[PDB]
């Protein structure tokens, strides 16, 4: 039950990353190597070769899209916009992370404004926590009742992927697998 995650025709935004539960079906991990090449393939707490011989209770697959340079933030103990306000991993994370370039699938001349991320928030994010709010962010107690202006900003920003950007700013598709023991 991996093809629908890796070969999905559309991927979710990072601020609303998709989660899929997997349980009750045998999984051949070798199939992952068939979707070559992977820009990053890093596992914490498990040997990639020995996964076929471990029977975990359940698995979770989280999928989203990010910039290339931000890919390093998907790891325990890291910090930044993605790590703080969009997607947090536990310090004792046990699972794998796969990321591959998608410049040919998620880049348009008009600029893909479909693919947003959260800029500012009043507090950090807990591990595997989500937040899909869209109320105006506030700086100063002069209330913003839903009117943009000074200190009243909508807290989402667009990636605006385009074909000509450098590798650092080009889109990357990310899938994170977590196992339950």
């Amino acid at each position: 039950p991996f093809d629908e995650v890796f070969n999905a025709t559309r991927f979710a935004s990072v601020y609303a990353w998709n989660r899929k539960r997997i349980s009750n079906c045998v999984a051949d991990y070798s199939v992952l190597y068939n979707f070559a090449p992977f820009f990053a393939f890093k596992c914490y707490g498990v040997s990639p070769t020995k996964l076929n011989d471990l029977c975990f209770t359940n698995v979770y697959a989280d999928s989203f899209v990010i910039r290339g340079n931000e890919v390093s933030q998907i790891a325990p103990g890291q910090t930044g916009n993605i790590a703080d306000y969009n997607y947090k991993l536990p310090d004792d994370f046990t699972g794998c992370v796969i990321a591959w370039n998608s410049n040919k699938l998620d880049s348009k001349v008009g600029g893909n404004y479909n693919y947003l991320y959260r800029l500012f928030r009043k507090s950090n994010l807990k591990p595997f926590e989500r937040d899909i709010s869209t109320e105006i962010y506030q700086a100063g107690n002069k209330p913003c009742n839903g009117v943009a202006g000074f200190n009243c900003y909508f807290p989402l920003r667009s990636y605006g992927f385009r074909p000509t950007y450098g590798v650092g700013h080009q889109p990357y598709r990310v899938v994170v697998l977590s196992f339950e023991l």
Epitope: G80, L119, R121, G140
Partner: antibody, heavy 113, light 102 residues
Framework: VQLVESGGGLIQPGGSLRLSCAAS????????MNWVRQAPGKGLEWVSV???????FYADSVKDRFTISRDNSKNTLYLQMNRLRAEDTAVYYC??????????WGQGTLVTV | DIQLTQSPSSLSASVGDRVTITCRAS??????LAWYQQNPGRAPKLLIY???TLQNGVPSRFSGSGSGTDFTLTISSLQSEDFATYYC?????FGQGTKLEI
């Protein structure tokens, strides 16, 4: 709206000092706060930044020698600078970064070494 | 490590002329570029952001354009109060700076 810096002065070479940027009409614990510096006769140089979530970042050339913090009750920001060099002599500015913009700037304070 | 270079390092013009300034990046970047003004002995003042958006309170005569690796700031008409230093900034990188004269 105000962002006023205080603390700069003549400090001995390698001395330790603390610069306090006091705010008004903005809340330090809510925005992205930045310390920038300008050396006389040269362009601006970004020094350090702190997010509203508590994360901090510094330039690689001055890391482990500076420390950025705040006091939320007093809506103040603080930069502890240790082992100051004449190369650290400059006017330091307290800026609010709003996405990819430094919309609000302070008058800054002079640190001589 | 993306670098920003401004040009010309200095130019002189009379009152009422049209002025153009260029900021060029070492390699192609999105249009996340801002232009700031600074008078001697004063804190820098934001002028433009996104390379085309004018900040509130900025006079309408300032304009900006460009993309890819080259961006430009234009002043249609000068004035006695238009002579100062200008900087182009992207993320955490500031330009070398530019000067204007009467």
């Amino acid at each position: 709206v105000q962002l006023v810096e205080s603390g700069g002065g003549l400090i001995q070479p390698g001395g330790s000092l603390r610069l306090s940027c006091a705010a008004s009409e903005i809340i330090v614990s809510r925005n992205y706060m930045n310390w920038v510096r300008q050396a006389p006769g040269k362009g601006l140089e970004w020094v350090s930044v702190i997010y509203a979530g508590g994360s901090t970042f510094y330039a690689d050339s001055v890391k482990d020698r500076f420390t950025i913090s705040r006091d939320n009750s007093k809506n103040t920001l603080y930069l502890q600078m240790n082992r100051l060099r004449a190369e650290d002599t400059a006017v330091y500015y307290c800026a609010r970064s709003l996405g990819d913009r430094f919309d609000f700037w302070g008058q800054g304070t002079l640190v001589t070494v | 490590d993306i670098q920003l270079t401004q040009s010309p390092s200095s130019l002189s013009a009379s009152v009422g002329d049209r002025v153009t300034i260029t900021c060029r990046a070492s390699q192609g970047i999105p249009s996340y570029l801002a232009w700031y003004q600074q008078n001697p002995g004063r804190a820098p003042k934001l002028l433009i952001y996104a390379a085309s958006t004018l900040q509130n309170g900025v006079p309408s005569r300032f304009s900006g354009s460009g993309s890819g690796t080259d961006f430009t700031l234009t002043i249609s008409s000068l004035q006695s109060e238009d002579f100062a230093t200008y900087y182009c900034q992207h993320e955490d990188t500031f330009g070398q700076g530019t000067k204007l004269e009467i």
